[PDB]
Short mmCIF file of N, CA and C in Angstrom, two decimals:
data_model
loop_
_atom_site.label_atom_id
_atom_site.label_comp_id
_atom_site.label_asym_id
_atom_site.label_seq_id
_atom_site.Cartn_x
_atom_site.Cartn_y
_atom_site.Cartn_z
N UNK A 1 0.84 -1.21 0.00
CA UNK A 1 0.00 0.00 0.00
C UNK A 1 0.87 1.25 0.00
N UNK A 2 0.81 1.75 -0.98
CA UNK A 2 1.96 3.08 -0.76
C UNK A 2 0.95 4.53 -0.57
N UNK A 3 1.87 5.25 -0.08
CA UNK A 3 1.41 6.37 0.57
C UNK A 3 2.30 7.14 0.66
N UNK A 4 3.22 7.43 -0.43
CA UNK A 4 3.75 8.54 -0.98
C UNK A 4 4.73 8.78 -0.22
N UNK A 5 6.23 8.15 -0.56
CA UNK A 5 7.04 8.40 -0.18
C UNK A 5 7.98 9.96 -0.31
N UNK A 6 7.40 10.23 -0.85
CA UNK A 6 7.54 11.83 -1.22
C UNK A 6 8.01 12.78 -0.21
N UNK A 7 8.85 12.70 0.99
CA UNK A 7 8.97 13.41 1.98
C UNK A 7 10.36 14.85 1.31
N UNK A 8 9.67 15.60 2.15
CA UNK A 8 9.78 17.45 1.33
C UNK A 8 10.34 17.85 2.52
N UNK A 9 11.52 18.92 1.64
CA UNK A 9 12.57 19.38 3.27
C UNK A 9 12.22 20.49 3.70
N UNK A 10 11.60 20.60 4.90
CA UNK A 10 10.86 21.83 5.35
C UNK A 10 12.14 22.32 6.69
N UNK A 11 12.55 23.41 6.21
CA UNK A 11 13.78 24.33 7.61
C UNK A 11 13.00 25.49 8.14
N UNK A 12 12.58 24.97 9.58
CA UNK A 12 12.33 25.66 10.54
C UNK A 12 13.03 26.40 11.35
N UNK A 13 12.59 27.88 11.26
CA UNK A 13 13.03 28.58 11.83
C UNK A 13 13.15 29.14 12.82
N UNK A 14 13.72 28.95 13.90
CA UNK A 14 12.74 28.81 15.58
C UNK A 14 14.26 29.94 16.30
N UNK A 15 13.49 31.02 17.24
CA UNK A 15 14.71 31.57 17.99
C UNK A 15 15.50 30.55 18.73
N UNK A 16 16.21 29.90 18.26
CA UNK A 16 17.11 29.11 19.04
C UNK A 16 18.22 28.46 17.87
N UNK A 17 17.55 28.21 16.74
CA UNK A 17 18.39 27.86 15.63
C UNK A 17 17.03 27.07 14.54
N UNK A 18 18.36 26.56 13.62
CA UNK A 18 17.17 26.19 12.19
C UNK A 18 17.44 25.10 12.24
N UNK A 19 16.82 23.91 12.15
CA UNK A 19 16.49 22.51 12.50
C UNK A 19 15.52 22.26 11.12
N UNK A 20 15.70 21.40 10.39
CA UNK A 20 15.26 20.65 8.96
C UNK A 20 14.45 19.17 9.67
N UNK A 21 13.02 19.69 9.24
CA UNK A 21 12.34 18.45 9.44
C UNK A 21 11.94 17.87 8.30
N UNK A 22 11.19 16.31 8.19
CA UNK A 22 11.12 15.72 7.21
C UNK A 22 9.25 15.45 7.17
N UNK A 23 8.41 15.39 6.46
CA UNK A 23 7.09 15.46 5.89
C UNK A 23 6.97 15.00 4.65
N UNK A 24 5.70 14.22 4.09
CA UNK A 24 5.73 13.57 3.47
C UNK A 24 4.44 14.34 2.51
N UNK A 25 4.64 14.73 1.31
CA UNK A 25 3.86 15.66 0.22
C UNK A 25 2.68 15.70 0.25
N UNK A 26 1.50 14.92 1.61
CA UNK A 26 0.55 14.61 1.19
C UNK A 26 -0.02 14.72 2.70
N UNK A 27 0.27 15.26 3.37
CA UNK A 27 -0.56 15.51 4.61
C UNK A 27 -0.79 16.84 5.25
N UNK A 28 -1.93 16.67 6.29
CA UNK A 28 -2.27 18.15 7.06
C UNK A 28 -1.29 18.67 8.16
N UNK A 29 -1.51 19.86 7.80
CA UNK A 29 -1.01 20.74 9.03
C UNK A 29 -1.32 20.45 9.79
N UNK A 30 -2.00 20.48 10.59
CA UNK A 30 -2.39 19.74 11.79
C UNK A 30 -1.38 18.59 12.67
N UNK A 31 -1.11 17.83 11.50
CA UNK A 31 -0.28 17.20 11.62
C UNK A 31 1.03 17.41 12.39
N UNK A 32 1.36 18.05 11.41
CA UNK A 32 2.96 18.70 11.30
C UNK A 32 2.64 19.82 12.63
N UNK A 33 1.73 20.29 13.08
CA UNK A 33 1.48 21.50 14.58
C UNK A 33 2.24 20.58 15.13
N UNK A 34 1.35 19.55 15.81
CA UNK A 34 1.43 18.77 16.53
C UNK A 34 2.80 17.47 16.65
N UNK A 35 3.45 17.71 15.29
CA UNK A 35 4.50 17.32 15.64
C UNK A 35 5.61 18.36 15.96
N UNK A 36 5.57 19.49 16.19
CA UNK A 36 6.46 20.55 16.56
C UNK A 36 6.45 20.42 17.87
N UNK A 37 5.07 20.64 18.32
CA UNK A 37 5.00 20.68 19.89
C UNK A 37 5.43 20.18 20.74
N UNK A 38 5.97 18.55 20.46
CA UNK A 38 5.91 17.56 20.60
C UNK A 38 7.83 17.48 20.91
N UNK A 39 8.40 17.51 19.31
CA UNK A 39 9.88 17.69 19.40
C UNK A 39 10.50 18.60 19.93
N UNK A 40 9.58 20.08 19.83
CA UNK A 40 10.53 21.31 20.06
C UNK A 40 9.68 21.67 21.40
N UNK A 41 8.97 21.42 21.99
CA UNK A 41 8.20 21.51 23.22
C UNK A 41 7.52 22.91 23.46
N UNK A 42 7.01 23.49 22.38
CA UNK A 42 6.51 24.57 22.68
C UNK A 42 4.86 25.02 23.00
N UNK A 43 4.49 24.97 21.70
CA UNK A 43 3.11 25.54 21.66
C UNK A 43 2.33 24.41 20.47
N UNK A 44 0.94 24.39 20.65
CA UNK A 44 0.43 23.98 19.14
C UNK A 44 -0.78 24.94 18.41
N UNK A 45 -1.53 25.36 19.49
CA UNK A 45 -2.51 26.17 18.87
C UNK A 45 -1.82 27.74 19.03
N UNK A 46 -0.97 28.11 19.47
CA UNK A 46 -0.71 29.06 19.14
C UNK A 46 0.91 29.43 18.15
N UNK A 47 0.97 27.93 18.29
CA UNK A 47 2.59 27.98 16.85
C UNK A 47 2.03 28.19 15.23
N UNK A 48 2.28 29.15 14.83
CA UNK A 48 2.60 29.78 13.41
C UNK A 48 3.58 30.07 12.80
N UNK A 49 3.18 28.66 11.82
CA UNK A 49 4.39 29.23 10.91
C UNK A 49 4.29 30.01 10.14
N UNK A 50 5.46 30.82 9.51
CA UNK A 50 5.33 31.66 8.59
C UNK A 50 6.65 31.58 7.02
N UNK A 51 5.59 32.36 5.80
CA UNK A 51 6.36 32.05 4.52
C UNK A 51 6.41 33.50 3.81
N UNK A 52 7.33 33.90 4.54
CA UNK A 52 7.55 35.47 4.18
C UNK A 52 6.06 36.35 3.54
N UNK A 53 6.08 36.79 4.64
CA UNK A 53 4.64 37.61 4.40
C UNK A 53 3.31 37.08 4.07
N UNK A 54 3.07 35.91 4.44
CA UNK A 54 2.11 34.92 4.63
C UNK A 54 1.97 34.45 5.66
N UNK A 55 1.08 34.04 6.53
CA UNK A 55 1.27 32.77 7.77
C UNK A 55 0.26 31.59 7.43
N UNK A 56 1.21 30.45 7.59
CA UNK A 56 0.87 28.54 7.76
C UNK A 56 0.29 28.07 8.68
N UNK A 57 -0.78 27.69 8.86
CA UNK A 57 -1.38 27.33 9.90
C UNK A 57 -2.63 26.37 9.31
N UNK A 58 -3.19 25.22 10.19
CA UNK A 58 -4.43 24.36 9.71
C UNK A 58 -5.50 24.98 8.72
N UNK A 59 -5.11 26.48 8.44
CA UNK A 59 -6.50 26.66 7.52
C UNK A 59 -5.83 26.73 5.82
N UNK A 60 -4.43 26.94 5.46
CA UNK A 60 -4.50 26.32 4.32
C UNK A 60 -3.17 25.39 4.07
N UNK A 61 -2.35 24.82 3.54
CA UNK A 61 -1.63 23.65 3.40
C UNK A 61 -0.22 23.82 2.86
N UNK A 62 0.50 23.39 3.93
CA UNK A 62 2.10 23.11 4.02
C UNK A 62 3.00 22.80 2.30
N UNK A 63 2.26 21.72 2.17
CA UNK A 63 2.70 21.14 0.97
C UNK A 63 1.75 21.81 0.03
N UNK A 64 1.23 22.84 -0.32
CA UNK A 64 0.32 23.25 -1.16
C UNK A 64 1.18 24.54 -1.87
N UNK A 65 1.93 25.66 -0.82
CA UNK A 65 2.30 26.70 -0.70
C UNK A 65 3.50 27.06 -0.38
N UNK A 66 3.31 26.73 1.20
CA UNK A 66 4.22 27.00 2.18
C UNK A 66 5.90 26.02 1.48
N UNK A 67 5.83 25.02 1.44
CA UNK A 67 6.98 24.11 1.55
C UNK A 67 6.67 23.45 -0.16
N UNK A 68 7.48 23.83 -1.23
CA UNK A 68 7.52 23.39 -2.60
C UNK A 68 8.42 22.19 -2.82
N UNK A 69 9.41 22.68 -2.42
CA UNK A 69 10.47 21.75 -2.52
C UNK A 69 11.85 22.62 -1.87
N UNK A 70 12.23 22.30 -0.39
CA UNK A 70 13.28 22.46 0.15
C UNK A 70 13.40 24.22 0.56
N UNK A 71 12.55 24.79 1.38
CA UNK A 71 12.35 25.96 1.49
C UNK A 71 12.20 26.50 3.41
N UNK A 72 12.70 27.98 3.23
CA UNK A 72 12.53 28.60 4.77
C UNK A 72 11.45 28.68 5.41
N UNK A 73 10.75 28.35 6.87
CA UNK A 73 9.71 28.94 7.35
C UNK A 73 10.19 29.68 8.20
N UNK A 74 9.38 30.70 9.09
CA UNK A 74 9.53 31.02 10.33
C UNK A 74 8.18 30.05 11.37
N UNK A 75 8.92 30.27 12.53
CA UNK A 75 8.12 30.41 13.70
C UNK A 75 7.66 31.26 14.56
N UNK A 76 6.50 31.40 14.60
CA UNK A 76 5.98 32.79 15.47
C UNK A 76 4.81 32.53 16.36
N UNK A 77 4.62 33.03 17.71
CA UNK A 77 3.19 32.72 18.62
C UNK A 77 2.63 34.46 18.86
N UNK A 78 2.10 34.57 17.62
CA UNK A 78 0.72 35.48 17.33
C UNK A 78 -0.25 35.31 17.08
N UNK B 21 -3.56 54.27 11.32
CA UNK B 21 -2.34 55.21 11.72
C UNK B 21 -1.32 54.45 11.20
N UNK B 22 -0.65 54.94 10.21
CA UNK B 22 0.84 54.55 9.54
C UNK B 22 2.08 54.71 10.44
N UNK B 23 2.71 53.92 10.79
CA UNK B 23 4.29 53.82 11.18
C UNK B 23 5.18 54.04 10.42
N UNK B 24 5.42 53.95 9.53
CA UNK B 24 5.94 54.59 8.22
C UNK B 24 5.51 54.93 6.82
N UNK B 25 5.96 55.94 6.65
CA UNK B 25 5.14 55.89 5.18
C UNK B 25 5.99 56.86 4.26
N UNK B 26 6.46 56.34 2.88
CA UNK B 26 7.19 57.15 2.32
C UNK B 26 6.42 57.06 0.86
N UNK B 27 6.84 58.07 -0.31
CA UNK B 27 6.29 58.05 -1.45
C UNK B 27 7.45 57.04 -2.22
N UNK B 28 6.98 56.28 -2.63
CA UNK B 28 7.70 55.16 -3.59
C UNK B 28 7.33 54.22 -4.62
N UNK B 29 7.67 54.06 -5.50
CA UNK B 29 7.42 53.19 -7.13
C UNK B 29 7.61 51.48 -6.88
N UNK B 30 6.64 50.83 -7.37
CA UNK B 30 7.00 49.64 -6.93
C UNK B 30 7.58 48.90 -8.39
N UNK B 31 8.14 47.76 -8.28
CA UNK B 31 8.30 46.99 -9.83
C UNK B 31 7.59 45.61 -9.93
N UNK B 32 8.14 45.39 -10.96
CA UNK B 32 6.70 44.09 -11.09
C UNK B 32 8.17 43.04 -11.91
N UNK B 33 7.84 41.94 -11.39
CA UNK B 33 8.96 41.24 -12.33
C UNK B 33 8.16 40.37 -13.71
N UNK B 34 8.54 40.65 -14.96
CA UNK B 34 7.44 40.57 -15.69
C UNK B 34 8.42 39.08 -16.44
N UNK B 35 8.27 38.04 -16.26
CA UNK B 35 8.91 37.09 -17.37
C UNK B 35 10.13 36.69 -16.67
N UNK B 36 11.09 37.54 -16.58
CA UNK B 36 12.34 37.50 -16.01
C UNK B 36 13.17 38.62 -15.73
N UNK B 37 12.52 39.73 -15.95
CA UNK B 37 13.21 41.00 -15.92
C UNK B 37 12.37 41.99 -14.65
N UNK B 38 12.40 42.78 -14.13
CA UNK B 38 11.89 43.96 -12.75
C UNK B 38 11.57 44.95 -13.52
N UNK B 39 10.92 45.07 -13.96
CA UNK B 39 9.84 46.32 -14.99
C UNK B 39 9.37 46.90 -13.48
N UNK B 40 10.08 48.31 -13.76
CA UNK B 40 9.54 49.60 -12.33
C UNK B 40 8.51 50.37 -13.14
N UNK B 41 7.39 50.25 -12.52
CA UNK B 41 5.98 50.64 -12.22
C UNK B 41 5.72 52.29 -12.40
N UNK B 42 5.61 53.30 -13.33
CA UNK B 42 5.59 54.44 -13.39
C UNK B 42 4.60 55.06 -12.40
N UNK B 43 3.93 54.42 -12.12
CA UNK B 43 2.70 54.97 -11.05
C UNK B 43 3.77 56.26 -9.75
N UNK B 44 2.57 56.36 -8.92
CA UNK B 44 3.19 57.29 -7.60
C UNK B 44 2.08 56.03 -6.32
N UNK B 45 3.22 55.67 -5.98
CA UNK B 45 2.92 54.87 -4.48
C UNK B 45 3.06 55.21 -3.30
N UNK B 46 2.64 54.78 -2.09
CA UNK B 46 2.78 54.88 -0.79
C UNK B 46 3.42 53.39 -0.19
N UNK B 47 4.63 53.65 0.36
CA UNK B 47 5.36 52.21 1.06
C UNK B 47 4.57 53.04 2.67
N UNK B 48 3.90 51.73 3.37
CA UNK B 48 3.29 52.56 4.78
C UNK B 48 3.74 50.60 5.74
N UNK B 49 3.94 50.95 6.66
CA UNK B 49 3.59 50.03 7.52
C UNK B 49 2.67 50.27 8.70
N UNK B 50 1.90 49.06 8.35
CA UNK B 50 0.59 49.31 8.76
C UNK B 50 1.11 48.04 10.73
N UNK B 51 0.22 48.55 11.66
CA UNK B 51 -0.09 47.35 12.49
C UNK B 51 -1.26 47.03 13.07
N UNK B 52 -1.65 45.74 13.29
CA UNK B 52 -3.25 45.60 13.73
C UNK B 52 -2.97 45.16 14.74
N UNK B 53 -4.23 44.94 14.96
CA UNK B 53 -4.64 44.01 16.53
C UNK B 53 -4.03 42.98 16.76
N UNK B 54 -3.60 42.16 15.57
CA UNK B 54 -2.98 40.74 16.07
C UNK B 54 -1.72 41.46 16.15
N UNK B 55 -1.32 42.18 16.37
CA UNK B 55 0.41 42.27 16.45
C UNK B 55 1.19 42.14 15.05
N UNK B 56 0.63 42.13 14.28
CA UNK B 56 1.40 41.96 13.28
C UNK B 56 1.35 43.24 11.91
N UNK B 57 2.57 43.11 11.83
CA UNK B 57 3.29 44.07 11.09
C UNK B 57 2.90 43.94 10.02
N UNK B 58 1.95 45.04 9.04
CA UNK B 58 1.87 44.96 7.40
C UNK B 58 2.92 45.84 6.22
N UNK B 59 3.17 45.49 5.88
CA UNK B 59 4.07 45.66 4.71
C UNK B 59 2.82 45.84 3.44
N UNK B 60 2.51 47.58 3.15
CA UNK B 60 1.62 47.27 1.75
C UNK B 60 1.96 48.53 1.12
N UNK B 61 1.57 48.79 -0.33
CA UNK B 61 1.76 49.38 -1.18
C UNK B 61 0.20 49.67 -1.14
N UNK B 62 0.13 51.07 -1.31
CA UNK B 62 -0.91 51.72 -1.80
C UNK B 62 -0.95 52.88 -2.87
N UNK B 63 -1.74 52.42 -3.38
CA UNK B 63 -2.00 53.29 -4.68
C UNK B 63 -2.45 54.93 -4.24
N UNK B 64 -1.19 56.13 -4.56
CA UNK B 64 -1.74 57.50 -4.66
C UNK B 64 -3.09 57.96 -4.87
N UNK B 65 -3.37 56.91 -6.50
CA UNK B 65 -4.77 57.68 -7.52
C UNK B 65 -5.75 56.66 -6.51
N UNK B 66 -5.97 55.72 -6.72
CA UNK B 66 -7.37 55.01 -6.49
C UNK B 66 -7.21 54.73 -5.05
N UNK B 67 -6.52 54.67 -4.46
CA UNK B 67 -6.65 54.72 -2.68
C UNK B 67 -6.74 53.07 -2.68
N UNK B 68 -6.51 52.66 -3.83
CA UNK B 68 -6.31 50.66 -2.85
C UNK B 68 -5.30 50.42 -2.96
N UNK B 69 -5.20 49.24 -2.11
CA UNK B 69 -3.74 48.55 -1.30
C UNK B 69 -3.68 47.38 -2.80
N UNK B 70 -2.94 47.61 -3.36
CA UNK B 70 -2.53 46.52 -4.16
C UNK B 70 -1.42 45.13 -3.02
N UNK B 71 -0.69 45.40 -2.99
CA UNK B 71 0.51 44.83 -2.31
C UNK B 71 0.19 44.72 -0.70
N UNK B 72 -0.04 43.42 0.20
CA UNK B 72 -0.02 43.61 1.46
C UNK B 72 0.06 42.55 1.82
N UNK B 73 1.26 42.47 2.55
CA UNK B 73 2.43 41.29 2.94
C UNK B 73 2.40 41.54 4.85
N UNK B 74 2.80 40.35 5.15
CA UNK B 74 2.65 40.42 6.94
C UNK B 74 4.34 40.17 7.00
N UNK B 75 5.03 41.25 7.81
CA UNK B 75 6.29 41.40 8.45
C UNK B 75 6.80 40.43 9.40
N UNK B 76 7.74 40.17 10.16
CA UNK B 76 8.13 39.18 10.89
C UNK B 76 9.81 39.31 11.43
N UNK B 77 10.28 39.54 11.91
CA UNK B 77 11.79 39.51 12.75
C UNK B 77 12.37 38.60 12.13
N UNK B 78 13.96 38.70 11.99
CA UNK B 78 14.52 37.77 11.71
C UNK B 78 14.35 36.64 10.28
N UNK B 79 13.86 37.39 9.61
CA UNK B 79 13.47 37.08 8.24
C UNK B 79 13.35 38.47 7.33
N UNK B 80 13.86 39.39 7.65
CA UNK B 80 13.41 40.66 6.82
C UNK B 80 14.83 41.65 6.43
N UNK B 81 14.73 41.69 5.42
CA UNK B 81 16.38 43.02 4.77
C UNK B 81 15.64 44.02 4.27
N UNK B 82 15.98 45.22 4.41
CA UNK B 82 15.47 46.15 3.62
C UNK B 82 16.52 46.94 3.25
N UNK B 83 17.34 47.02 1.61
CA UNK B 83 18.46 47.93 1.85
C UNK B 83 18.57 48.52 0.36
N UNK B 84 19.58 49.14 0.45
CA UNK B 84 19.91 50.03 -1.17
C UNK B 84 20.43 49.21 -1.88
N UNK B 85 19.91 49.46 -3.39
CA UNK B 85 21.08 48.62 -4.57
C UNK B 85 22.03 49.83 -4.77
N UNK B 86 23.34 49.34 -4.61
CA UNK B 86 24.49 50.02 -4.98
C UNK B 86 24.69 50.11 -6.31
N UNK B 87 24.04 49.24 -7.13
CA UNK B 87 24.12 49.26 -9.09
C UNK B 87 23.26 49.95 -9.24
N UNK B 88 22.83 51.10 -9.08
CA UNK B 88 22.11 52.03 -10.05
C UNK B 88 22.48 53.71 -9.65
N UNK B 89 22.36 53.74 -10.61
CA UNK B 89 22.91 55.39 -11.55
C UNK B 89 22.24 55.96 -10.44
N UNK B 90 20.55 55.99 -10.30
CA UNK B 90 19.94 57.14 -9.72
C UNK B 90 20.46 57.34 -8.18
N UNK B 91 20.70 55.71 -7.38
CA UNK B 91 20.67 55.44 -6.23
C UNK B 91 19.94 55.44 -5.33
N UNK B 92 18.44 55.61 -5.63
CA UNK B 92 17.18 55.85 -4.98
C UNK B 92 17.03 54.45 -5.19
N UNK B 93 17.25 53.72 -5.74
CA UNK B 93 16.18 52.37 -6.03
C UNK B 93 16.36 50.93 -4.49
N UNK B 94 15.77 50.75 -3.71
CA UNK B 94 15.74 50.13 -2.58
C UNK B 94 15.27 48.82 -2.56
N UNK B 95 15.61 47.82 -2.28
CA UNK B 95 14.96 46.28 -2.07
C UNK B 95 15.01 45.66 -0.72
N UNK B 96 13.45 45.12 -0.42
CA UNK B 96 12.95 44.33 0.63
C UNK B 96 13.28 42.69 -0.07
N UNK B 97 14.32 42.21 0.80
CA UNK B 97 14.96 40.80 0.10
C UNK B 97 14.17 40.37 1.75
N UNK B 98 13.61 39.05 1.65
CA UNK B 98 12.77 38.07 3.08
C UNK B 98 14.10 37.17 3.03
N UNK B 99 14.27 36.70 4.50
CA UNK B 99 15.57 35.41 4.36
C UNK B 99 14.74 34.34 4.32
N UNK B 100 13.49 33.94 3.71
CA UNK B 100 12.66 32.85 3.97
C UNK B 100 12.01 33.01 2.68
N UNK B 101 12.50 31.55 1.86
CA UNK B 101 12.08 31.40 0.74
C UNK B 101 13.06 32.09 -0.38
N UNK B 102 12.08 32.76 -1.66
CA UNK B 102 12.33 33.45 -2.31
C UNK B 102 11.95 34.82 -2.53
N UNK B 103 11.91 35.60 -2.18
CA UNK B 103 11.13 37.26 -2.38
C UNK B 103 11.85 38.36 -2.39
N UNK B 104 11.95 38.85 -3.23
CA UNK B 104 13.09 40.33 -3.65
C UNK B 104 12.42 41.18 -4.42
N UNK B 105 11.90 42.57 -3.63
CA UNK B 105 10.76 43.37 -3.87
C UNK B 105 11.97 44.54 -4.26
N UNK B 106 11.81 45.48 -5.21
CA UNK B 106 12.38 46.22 -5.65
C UNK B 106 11.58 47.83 -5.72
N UNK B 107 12.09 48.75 -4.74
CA UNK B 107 11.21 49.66 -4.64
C UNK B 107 12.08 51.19 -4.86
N UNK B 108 11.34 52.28 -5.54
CA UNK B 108 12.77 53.75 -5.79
C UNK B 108 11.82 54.84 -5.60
N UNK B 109 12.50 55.39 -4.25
CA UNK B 109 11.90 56.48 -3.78
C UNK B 109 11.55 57.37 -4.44
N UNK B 110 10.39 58.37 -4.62
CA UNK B 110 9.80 59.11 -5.04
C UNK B 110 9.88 60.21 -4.39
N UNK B 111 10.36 60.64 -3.33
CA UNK B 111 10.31 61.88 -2.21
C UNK B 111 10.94 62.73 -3.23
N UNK B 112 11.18 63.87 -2.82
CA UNK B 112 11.72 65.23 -3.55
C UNK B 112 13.09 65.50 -3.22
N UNK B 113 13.63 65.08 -2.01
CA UNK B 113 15.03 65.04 -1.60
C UNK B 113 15.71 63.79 -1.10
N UNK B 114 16.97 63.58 -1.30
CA UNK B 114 17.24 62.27 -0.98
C UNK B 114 17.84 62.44 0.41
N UNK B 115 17.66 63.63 1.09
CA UNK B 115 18.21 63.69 2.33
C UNK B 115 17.42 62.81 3.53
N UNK B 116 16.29 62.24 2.80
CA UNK B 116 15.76 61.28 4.11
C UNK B 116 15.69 59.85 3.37
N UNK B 117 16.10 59.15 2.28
CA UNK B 117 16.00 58.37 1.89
C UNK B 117 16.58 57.34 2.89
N UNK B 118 17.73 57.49 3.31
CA UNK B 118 18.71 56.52 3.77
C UNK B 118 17.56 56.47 5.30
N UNK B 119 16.77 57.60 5.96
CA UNK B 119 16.45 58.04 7.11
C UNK B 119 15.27 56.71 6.94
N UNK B 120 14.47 56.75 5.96
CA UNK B 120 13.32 55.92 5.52
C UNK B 120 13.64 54.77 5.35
N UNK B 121 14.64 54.47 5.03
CA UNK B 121 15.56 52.92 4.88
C UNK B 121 15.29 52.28 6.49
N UNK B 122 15.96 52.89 7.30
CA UNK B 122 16.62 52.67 8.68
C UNK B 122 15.62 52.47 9.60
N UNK B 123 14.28 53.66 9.09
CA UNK B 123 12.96 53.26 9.72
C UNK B 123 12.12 52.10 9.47
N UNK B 124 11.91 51.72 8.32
CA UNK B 124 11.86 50.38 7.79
C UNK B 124 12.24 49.37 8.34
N UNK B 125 13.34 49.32 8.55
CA UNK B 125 14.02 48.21 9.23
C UNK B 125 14.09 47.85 10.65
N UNK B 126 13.75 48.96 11.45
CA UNK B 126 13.67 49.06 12.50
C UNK B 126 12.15 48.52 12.87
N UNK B 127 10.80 48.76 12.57
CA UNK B 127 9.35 48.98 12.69
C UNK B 127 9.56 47.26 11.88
N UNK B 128 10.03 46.91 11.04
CA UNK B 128 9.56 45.14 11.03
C UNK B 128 10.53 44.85 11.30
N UNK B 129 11.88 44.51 11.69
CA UNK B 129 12.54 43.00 12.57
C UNK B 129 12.22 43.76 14.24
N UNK B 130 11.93 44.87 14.42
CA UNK B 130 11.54 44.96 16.13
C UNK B 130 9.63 45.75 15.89
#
């Protein structure tokens, strides 16, 4: 059963340093919140990412926009 | 209420080349309620915001191109992603250009 091995290099940008996580072309944000929170121990409903003058968050999609192929985010709690 | 606001030309990158925009613009930074910093271009004649981008620390350059003749011409380069906005002051003296630079930069990474 495949399910898209397709994983896309997303570099997070967090005040502490930039750390490269791995995601796979075909899933929700939601997702990916909740795995931040988790590794980097911060926030989930209030972690936003951001794509230069845009912000990423569960209402539209990581792999849609935000993350093409091998690209910067920020992190921000606004 | 504007935090900054200077008269400035925006460009458009058309194909592969930065075609500058003959119009008369307003560079303003705007801030709202959520805390967050707007970055927009508004149109002199028709009073709308064409251009309006959200600011952020630590992801933001705003500085002079040293290759041009006039030396007015200014670019907002983001360290996130790809984005290199190309903008040339319109004011009447260039004695606050560099002043408008510095404010810029100051009002989005703080």
């Amino acid at each position: 059963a495949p399910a898209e091995p397709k994983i896309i290099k997303v570099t997070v940008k967090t005040p502490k340093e930039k750390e490269e996580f791995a995601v796979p072309e075909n899933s929700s944000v939601q997702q990916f919140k909740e795995a931040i929170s988790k590794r980097f121990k911060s926030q989930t409903d209030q972690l936003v990412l951001i794509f230069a003058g845009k912000i990423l968050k569960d209402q539209d999609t990581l792999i849609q926009h935000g993350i093409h192929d091998g690209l910067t985010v920020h992190l921000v709690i606004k | 209420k504007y935090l900054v606001e200077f008269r400035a030309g925006k460009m458009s990158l058309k194909g592969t080349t930065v075609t500058p925009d003959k119009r008369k613009g307003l560079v303003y930074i705007q801030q709202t309620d959520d805390s967050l910093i707007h970055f927009c271009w508004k149109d002199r004649t028709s009073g709308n915001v064409e251009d309006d981008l959200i600011i952020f620390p630590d992801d933001c350059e705003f500085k002079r191109v040293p290759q041009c003749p006039s030396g007015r011409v200014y670019v907002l380069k983001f360290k996130a992603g790809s984005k290199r906005l190309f903008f040339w002051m319109q004011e009447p003296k260039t004695d606050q250009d560099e002043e408008h630079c510095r404010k810029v930069n100051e009002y989005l990474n703080n």
